[PDB]
Design a protein around this nucleic acid. Structure first.
Ligand code: MG
Ligand code: MG
Ligand code: MG
Lengths: 152, 152
DNA sequence: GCAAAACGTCGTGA
DNA sequence: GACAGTTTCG
DNA sequence: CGAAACTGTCTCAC
DNA sequence: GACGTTTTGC
């Protein structure tokens, strides 16, 4: 369970508030109990010309990877366990995305609980709604209300 | 000169590397001896709904101001003396724009001597070419080559 | 059934 | 993000 | 003459 | 920046 240096976390929190994204999604997928997956992702986006910065994050954070999408690349961290450890430590230094960070930690803690009840799942879905509302969301489709398709 | 907190600088350096900009420009203006102004700017851009963050920077940095340009706003610091003091303390924590910062400090220190030798003005306009080369410059029009119109 | 990965771009917020 | 044009004022 | 603010916008990199 | 839609394999 990796412990991060405060100076690294302070700088990174600023970079994240700038070009990072703390995302929560509800993905329809019929292979799941409630027909949807609760997806969480921490990412940092940067011009591919500066991929080096992202590859560095992979080494420095110790988990995650960099995906390439042409002119732009992204450091991605989705693994729930390392995500919770990392956001717990980064959270206190965030100024713009502190609330979404805490909502993500909140969701992660209730996942085992949500995968047990339709109401618990729907409740967690309302928290992903809150994260989206805090972000500069512009193409969101699946919401907690969409999951209300469980009414069947 | 004001001394800034280390943790403040750590966080800000990260935010600056993400959404800030360290700019150097040669502005055509006939009222100047060499027909051009050497302009230096430190700025942080953010969606206007988050202008509070920029306003807070004015208070924390203690100098500068915030301007509005529609759905986006910017914290600007151009006062040469406070700019030098600020960048001097920020520079050691920058990762993507550390070079740009150091070139600005260099330009600032050579401004008085650049106000004389027309060839010293061109050498400084060189430092400016370097900064623009390091940034994601896409609409630059006035360069040192332009200033080379000092030939009479 | 589910934890992550892998791939696709839209609408800006830089 | 990263400049470029216009105006103000000691 | 010039530092510094007021004002406007290309092309994305987020 | 912040999604969406589909595919992987214990
Ligand atoms: Mg940003
Ligand atoms: Mg950036
Ligand atoms: Mg940005």
């Amino acid at each position: 369970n990796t412990k991060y240096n405060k100076e690294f976390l302070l700088y990174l929190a600023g970079f994240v508030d700038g070009d990072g994204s703390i995302i929560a999604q509800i993905k329809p997928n019929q292979s799941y109990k409630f027909k949807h997956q609760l997806s969480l992702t921490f990412q940092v986006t940067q011009k591919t010309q500066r991929r080096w910065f992202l590859d560095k994050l992979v080494d420095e954070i110790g988990v995650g990877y960099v995906r390439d999408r042409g002119s732009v690349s992204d450091y991605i961290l989705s693994e729930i366990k390392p995500l919770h450890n990392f956001l717990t430590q980064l959270q206190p230094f965030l100024k713009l995305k502190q609330k979404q960070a805490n909502l993500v930690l909140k969701i992660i803690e209730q996942l085992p609980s949500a995968k047990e009840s339709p109401d618990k799942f729907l409740e967690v879905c309302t928290w992903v709604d809150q994260i989206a509302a805090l972000n500069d969301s512009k193409t969101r489709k699946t919401t907690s209300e969409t999951v209300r398709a469980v009414l069947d």
